[PDB]
RNA sequence: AAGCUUCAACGCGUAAGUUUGGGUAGCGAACCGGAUUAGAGACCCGGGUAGUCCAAACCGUCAACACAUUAUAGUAAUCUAUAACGCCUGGUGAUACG
């Protein structure tokens, strides 16, 4: 009985979800690496940042009036953009490998965003005073298809839960 | 004087009435303890919890 | 002859090419870099965006298409999603297979040993390349040994 | 995360129901996969200041401590457990580290 | 970091050998002992990371009299870091 | 508002070369023997920290009579606390840890400690 | 090297002010009352409404100052080489248009 109490202590059930998400964060570092314990290759970086922006975007439809680490949310999004746009130039097979495993589009840069020879399907958006989350939400929805899927899923969920 | 265990987190009356609490329901400030100032601030926090507590 | 990056291929039998040409200004003794855009004929549409191409003057084909594509030097590698999933399969197969064959020797020890001996085999190889190129000599300079 | 609760209790009731009140809080933390480490009271201490602006209960109040390991989901039921009962006045719930360095 | 031992006076102090320097502490005759501060005086970066300047060598002579006494540091691909 | 600079031999030199007048008489002194003017700046505050501080802090915490030797400052013979700390340190670099060295230093230098406490009790009976 | 800067764009933004909802310990514009003085509209004594309080939005300007741009390289700079910047060009005249 007392060993059962010890294993229910040492479980991840009891922890605060800061520590729970940190333990599954080194689970993800065990997943995405090229290697036994590589923690600084750029695939590790973008895996951490993509997962991080997913639990923070859940937290940030939950809390809207937060303002201090929303700067940090921008810092993750911009440094992730820097990391993909570097890694495409640097090691392309790792680039394609990661944004297939995570399932992300291409975000590289009177210009074209490196489309093919033929079949030049395109996606460009240019305008012809906002608050924060009313603009930071649809960008982060826009580049990432998993977040768009979560958006349409929770939209259908609320529309059939109110009905 | 700076024995950490039983003084660092502990809100009970004895240590604070000995060396941390002014007599008129008030506290002993930084100059009257001669203790490391961050540790003093955290135990001053503990004492000032204990002035919100049912004790003191 | 220009060697400059493509930027547009949305365009029939014609690619828009940008070249970094540097103009002098006399006032400040500073070379200012501008980039001009040219329209150039290609024939095979093998130019994906990001390719480094060689354009040359030929007979004009239009009002503003004036060069012709000679050769694409460095190919721009492109995102194929199914091939990317194939690299996912091969890459985690390689990682799991290496960890299973390895897994006391914690796997870092075995891989770092393999990287040490791989670097040693490399250093022996380029050292013997230097040995066949030069002979027994101090690595002072190759400019000294060019005599 | 183990949670101390140096909470107050009504001063001189017959103990037939304050023990039942702790049975209720023990039932509340009994749920959600966690349990009390030690239930250490301090008997009774007369207080330092009066409380209950409505009904004027007074000092001489009773003291209890729970020391329970709980996942964070159980706190909102514990908030109801400490909020609905008018036999208790104040409750202080503190996190404690995994070295089990409790009060 | 790379610690330059600056030449304070009008002699190098080879018997000092201020850290690294010329091997062997023997000049022939000992010299004056001047108290001058540090002889690289008012060094001017005349190339400049925005504007590189080629000075075709007669222009280099005619701008050498524009500035006070001292030696240009120059680059050339066949010769490296030159005067 | 000018600036302090080189001194006296660059200041004599550009006069003395031309045959202005004869020198101040110590020119042979000024030339044959190397100087240094205080070329005054801060290359870095060299606060080179003593290794004997933790050993002397512990020994002065444990035996405070080691604050009370008479000691000749101007002869470089070491005092008793220094042989304490040097004995502990030479047992440290011998390979043992700190506390076993402190115990061996307690055994191997206590004799002068009871000699000193006898001397201090004699001075105590002298003063009172 | 994925670094530096930010033209452009875009957010943060003390406090006032406005729209919406109410009601409100203390704080303190109006409105009436009295005072140094000849008139007194102010300082000061005297009650005290919006607003200060809350929740949502708009505004975004200022001795918002290290008046010390940002960053790197040197031992917390106003010792100063550079990288991208932003701003000034005698004073009075910046308000009016768009």
Automatic annotation (TrEMBL), chain B:
What is the superkingdom listed in this entry's lineage? Answer: Eukaryota
Known partners and oligomeric status: Part of the 30S ribosomal subunit.
Family label: Belongs to the bacterial ribosomal protein bS18 family.
- What this protein is called in its record is Small ribosomal subunit protein bS18c
- Positions spanned in the full protein: 238 to 293 of 356
From TrEMBL, chain C:
The family line of this record is: Belongs to the universal ribosomal protein uS17 family.
Entry's Gene Ontology cellular component terms: mitochondrion; ribonucleoprotein complex; ribosome
What residue ranges are annotated as transmembrane? none
Assigned keywords, A-Z: Ribonucleoprotein, Ribosomal protein
Keyword Ribonucleoprotein in annotation = yes
What is a single molecular function from GO for this protein? structural constituent of ribosome
A biological process (GO) annotation for this entry? translation
UniProt protein name: Mitochondrial ribosomal protein S17
Automatic annotation (TrEMBL), chain D:
Output one GO BP term. Answer: translation
User: A Gene Ontology molecular-function term?
Assistant: structural constituent of ribosome
- Which cellular components does GO assign to this protein? cytoplasm; ribosome
**Top-level division of the source organism's lineage:** Eukaryota
Task: Say which family it is in.
Answer: Belongs to the bacterial ribosomal protein bS6 family.
The name this protein goes by in its record: Uncharacterized protein
Its source organism is Chlamydomonas reinhardtii (Chlamydomonas smithii)
Entire protein: which part is shown? 2 to 104 of 122
From TrEMBL, chain E:
What name has this protein been given in UniProt?
Uncharacterized protein
Source organism of this protein record: Chlamydomonas reinhardtii (Chlamydomonas smithii)
Q: What is the lineage of its organism?
A: Eukaryota, Viridiplantae, Chlorophyta, core chlorophytes, Chlorophyceae
Part of the intact protein present: 166 to 248 of 412
């Amino acid at each position: 009985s007392k060993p059962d109490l010890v294993e229910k202590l040492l479980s991840s059930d009891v922890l605060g979800k800061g520590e729970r998400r940190r333990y599954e964060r080194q689970a993800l570092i065990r997943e995405f690496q090229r290697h036994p314990a590589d923690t600084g290759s750029p695939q590790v970086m973008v895996a951490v940042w993509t997962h991080r922006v997913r639990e923070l975007v859940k937290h940030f439809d939950a809390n809207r009036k937060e303002l201090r680490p929303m700067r940090e949310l921008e810092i993750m999004m911009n440094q992730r953009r820097r990391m993909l746009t570097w890694l495409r130039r640097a090691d392309f097979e790792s680039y394609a490998y990661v944004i297939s495993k995570l399932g992300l589009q291409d975000i590289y840069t009177x210009x074209x965003x490196x489309x093919x020879x033929x079949x030049x399907x395109x996606x460009x958006x240019x305008x012809x005073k906002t608050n924060l989350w009313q603009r930071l939400r649809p960008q982060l929805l826009a580049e990432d298809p998993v977040l768009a899927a979560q958006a349409v899923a929770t939209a259908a969920a609320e529309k059939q839960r109110q009905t | 004087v700076a024995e950490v265990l039983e003084k660092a987190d502990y809100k009970n009356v004895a240590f604070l009435t000995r060396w941390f609490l002014s007599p008129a329901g008030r506290l002993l400030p930084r100059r009257q303890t001669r203790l490391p100032v961050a540790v003093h601030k955290h135990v001053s926090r503990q004492v000032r919890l204990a002035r919100h507590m049912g004790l003191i | 002859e220009f060697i400059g990056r493509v930027v547009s291929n949305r365009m029939q039998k014609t690619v828009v090419v940008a070249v970094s040409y540097v103009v002098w200004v006399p006032k400040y003794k500073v070379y200012q870099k501008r980039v001009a855009r040219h329209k150039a004929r290609d024939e095979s549409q093998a130019s994906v965006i990001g390719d480094i191409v060689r354009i040359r003057k030929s007979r004009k084909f239009s009002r503003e298409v004036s060069y012709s594509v000679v050769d694409t030097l460095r190919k721009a590698h492109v995102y194929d999603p199914a091939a990317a999933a194939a690299l996912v399969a091969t890459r985690d197969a390689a990682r799991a297979a290496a960890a299973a064959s390895t897994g006391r020797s914690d796997p870092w020890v075995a891989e770092a040993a393999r990287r040490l001996d791989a670097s040693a085999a490399r250093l022996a190889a380029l050292r013997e390349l230097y040995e066949k190129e030069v002979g027994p000599g101090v690595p002072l300079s190759g400019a000294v040994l060019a005599v | 995360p183990l949670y101390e609760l140096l909470m107050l209790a009504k001063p001189s009731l017959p103990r037939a129901e304050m023990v039942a009140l702790i049975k209720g809080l023990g039932d509340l933390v009994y749920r959600n996969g966690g349990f009390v480490t030690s239930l250490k009271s301090f008997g009774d201490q007369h207080l330092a200041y009066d409380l209950r602006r409505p009904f004027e209960k007074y000092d001489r109040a009773h003291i209890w401590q729970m020391d329970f390991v709980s996942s964070v989901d159980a706190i909102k039921p514990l908030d109801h457990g400490l909020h609905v009962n008018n036999t208790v006045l104040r409750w202080v719930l503190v996190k404690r580290p995994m070295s089990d360095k409790s009060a | 970091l790379i610690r330059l031992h600056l030449r304070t006076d009008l002699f190098s102090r080879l018997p000092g050998a201020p850290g690294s320097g010329a091997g062997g502490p023997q000049p022939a005759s000992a010299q004056l002992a001047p108290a001058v501060g540090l002889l690289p005086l008012s060094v001017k970066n005349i190339s400049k990371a925005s504007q590189p300047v080629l000075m075709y060598p007669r222009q280099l002579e005619e701008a050498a009299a524009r500035l006070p006494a001292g030696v240009f540091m120059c680059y050339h691909p066949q010769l490296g870091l030159i005067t | 508002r000018p600036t302090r600079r080189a001194n006296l031999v660059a200041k004599l030199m550009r006069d003395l070369e031309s045959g202005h007048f004869a020198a101040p008489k110590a020119l042979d002194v000024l030339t044959q023997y190397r100087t240094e003017q205080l070329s005054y700046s801060l290359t870095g505050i060299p606060r080179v920290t003593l290794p004997e501080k933790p050993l002397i802090r512990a020994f002065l915490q444990k035996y405070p009579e080691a604050r009370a030797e008479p000691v000749a400052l101007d002869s470089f013979t070491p005092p008793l606390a220094r042989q304490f700390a040097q004995r502990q340190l030479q047992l440290m670099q011998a390979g043992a840890a700190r506390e076993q060295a402190f115990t061996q230093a307690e055994q191997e230098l206590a004799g002068r400690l009871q000699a000193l406490r006898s001397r201090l009790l004699g001075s105590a009976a002298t003063a009172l």
